[PDB]
A paper describes a structure:
We identified a novel GST in the genome of the shrimp pathogen V. parahaemolyticus FIM- S1708+, a bacterial strain associated with Acute Hepatopancreatic Necrosis Disease (AHPND)/Early Mortality Syndrome (EMS) in cultured shrimp. This new GST class was named Gtt2.
The crystal of VpGSTT2 had a monoclinic unit cell with space group P1211, and the diffraction data of VpGSTT2-GTS were scaled and refined at a resolution of 1.92 Å. VpGSTT2 consists of two monomers per asymmetric unit. Each has the canonical GST topology, with a thioredoxin-like domain at the N-terminus and a globular C-terminal domain. The GSH-binding domain (residues 1–81) is called the G-site, while the hydrophobic substrates are bound at the H-site (residues 82–204). The RMSD between the two monomers in the asymmetric unit was 0.36 Å, with only minor differences in the N-terminal domain’s loops and β-sheet 2. The electron density was clear for residue H2O-300 for monomer A and H2O-107 for monomer B. In the apo-VpGSTT2, a loop containing residues 36–39 moved towards the G-site cavity, causing steric hindrance to GSH binding.
Residue numbers in the entry:
A (entry chain B): 1 to 115, 128 to 212
B (entry chain A): 1 to 115, 121 to 212
Write the structure that this text describes.
């Protein structure tokens, strides 16, 4: 299999960090950037959502969506990190908190970043979610469960959006997010994630 | 366990259809509708997202988000439907197509139905959201010309979500989907005939 990606974009970094966490290695194929994760006119039919990252299997089957690629790669490389949840309850809690972080945090941050009235509304929803996330991190070491999971990769990208893309002073105002972020950003798999340049 | 729900709302019907498919039974607790779409009352802190449906386990743990509730129930009631996918590839394709249908279809249909755009008011965002629904429908129709179901060749949770999405488009947004997209129509005729979808309230779900 091979992973099609652009050089420095949040969607692709979600998969890159996941792969480093589980100790997997997948051949990369670099693509040109189009506009909004987009693929070229001649390359877009390979991707159902029309975007990178794109995982291509040996017979030509392609999987798009960063989380879908991560799920496939989780089963491709034996590992003990259980990033989608170690037991039945954790698997449901991971699903719950992943969708909460994605809808209330990541997607709103994306909308606010690329944008004026909807971008401002999207930014307000980000600001309203941060106290909810901070309160959660005051009573749980990680977002979804007591252990590091894929939700923490997604949350890290979301907070990276908020601080480095939207100029929100998250860490000044929310010490529990800051505690968790300091912890997660120290993990080996997050090094050279491009955080400092990812949201320029 | 207990499932907290309101009487006739799409998010709760997503769980109800799934539970019927896998042959599970869970005690239901009716709640009042609080508008704001699916929002809970002053008891909302038991729900991380503040909405119904809400699953409460025997030990008091609560799980919100319809798909997360379905994932737990799938393991709680052993079944051979493999609604999340039967093997590694199917599980990834389910995840891929579920997210495509949810973002590009269902979520946009919700926003158009309930309606905040680039230098605009709330009405223009609803019109923009409706245009996104219309742009995704050809992609779904082309998929259903090559696959019997949305995510794979087998019925999966994505087809439950697609059914709710197309219900939104036709019965909520007055889009003549079936006239223009015969493969969606074929698939919808097939899925809407399943026993678990009977009495889903389709005719009244989007009033």
């Amino acid at each position: 299999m091979k992973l099609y990606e652009t050089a420095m974009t949040p969607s692709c970094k979600r998969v890159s960090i996941f792969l480093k966490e589980i100790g997997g290695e997948v051949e990369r194929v670099a693509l040109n950037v189009r506009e909004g994760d987009n693929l070229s006119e001649s390359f877009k039919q390979k991707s159902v959502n029309g975007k990178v990252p794109l995982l291509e299997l040996d017979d030509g089957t392609t999987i798009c969506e960063s989380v879908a690629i991560c799920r496939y790669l989780d089963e491709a490389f034996e590992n003990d990190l259980a990033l989608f949840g170690a037991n039945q309850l954790e698997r449901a809690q991971v699903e719950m908190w992943h969708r909460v972080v994605e809808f209330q945090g990541l997607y709103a941050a994306f909308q606010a970043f690329r944008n004026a009235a909807w971008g401002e509304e999207s930014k307000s929803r980000v600001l309203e979610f941060l106290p909810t996330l901070d309160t959660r991190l005051s009573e749980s070491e990680y977002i979804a469960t007591d252990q590091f999971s894929v939700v923490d990769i997604t949350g890290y990208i979301f907070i990276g959006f908020a601080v480095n893309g939207l100029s929100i002073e998250v860490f000044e105002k929310y010490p529990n997010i800051a505690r968790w972020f300091e912890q997660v950003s120290a993990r080996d798999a997050f090094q050279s994630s491009g955080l400092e340049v990812l949201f320029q």
